[PDB]
Design a protein around this ligand. Structure first.
Ligand SMILES: O=c1ccn([C@@H]2O[C@H](COP(=O)(O)OP(=O)(O)O[C@H]3O[C@H](CO)[C@H](O)[C@H](O)[C@H]3F)[C@@H](O)[C@H]2O)c(=O)[nH]1
Ligand SMILES: [Mn+2]
Length: 280
């Protein structure tokens, strides 16, 4: 499968860890990494590729310009401008009709092929519902969504590239961001939801297990709709842990579930540059 990650120099070492976890979950699957590079040094991309299979044979860094999104709101502190690069997927990747976008702060624990094998038909993408946002009575509607349309998290995405390449997603994002600039609160996550509402395929929450999903394991469903309940019901085992929010598995005092696998994988790296010692 073709996996897509987006990062800048600051997250280079983390990109490496998330990347390796994907490989560990797919021992016999050919993982092709496409990285949206917003300023990763040559030393940093060299160390990354060095820690993966084939001495970094299945990874290509695609240069992107962070200044491109300079006008987009950046209210959430722990997130950098690089978060909006995914909006130009259709422009940065040609050799794929389908890719699976992953946030750097994810930890892939199980095969992703069941999610990958999803047939998105003519929809824009496949994604997991976001409970934290979905249960914030009245928000989803500020961006034009209906109670029946479900707000998804942009940390894990099966994108129908061929369809994306047909449209000018960056211009529609600009247009939308001008329409809902004084209300959106989740940035690129808002853009994607507004733009593709009503045309999204939903996947079980096992492919995007977040803190809110976890907390719910200790159950009360924002809806009665059988589809929603079916989707927001994680079918064990968790395939993707998404450390959504300010607390990351690489931080100090991380209490988030399964956060140990980060270290387990960090301590298994082939090459660790002196400058990475800290971060890990
Ligand atoms: O120093 C940084 C900070 C952010 N990033 C990029 O930004 C993504 C964005 O942020 P987090 O993973 O840190 O975001 P977070 O998951 O905490 O929060 C929520 O809001 C985000 C947007 O503001 C996304 O929609 C995200 O999927 C959603 F869960 C990272 O994966 C990465 O691609 C970097 O490369 N370096
Ligand atoms: Mn994230």
């Amino acid at each position: 499968m073709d996996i897509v990650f987006a990062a800048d120099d600051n997250y280079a070492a983390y990109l490496c860890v998330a990347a390796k976890s994907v490989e560990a979950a797919h021992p016999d699957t050919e993982i092709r990494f496409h990285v949206l590079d917003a300023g990763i040094s040559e030393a940093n991309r060299a160390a990354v590729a060095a820690n993966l299979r084939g001495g970094g044979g299945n990874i290509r860094f695609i240069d992107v310009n962070p200044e491109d999104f300079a006008g987009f709101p950046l209210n959430i502190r722990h997130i950098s401008i690089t978060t909006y690069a995914r909006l130009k997927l259709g422009e940065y990747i040609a050799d794929c009709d389908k890719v699976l976008y992953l946030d750097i702060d994810v930890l892939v624990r199980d095969s992703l092929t069941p999610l990958w094998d999803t047939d998105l038909g003519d929809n824009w993408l496949g994604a997991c519902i976001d409970l934290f946002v979905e249960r914030q009575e009245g928000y989803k509607q500020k961006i034009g969504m209906a109670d029946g349309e479900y707000y998804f998290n942009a940390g894990v995405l099966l994108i129908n590239l061929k369809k994306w390449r047909r449209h000018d997603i960056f211009k529609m994002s600009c247009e939308w961001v001008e329409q809902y600039k004084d209300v959106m609160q989740y940035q690129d996550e808002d853009i994607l939801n507004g733009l593709f509402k009503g045309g999204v395929c939903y996947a079980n929450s096992r492919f995007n297990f977040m803190p809110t999903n976890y907390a719910f394991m200790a159950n009360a469903s924002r809806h009665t709709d059988p589809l929603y309940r079916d989707r927001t019901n994680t079918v064990m085992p968790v395939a993707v842990s998404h450390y959504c929010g300010p607390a990351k598995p690489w931080h100090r005092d991380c209490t988030a579930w399964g956060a140990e696998r980060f270290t387990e994988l960090a301590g298994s790296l082939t090459t660790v540059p002196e400058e990475w010692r800290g971060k890990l």
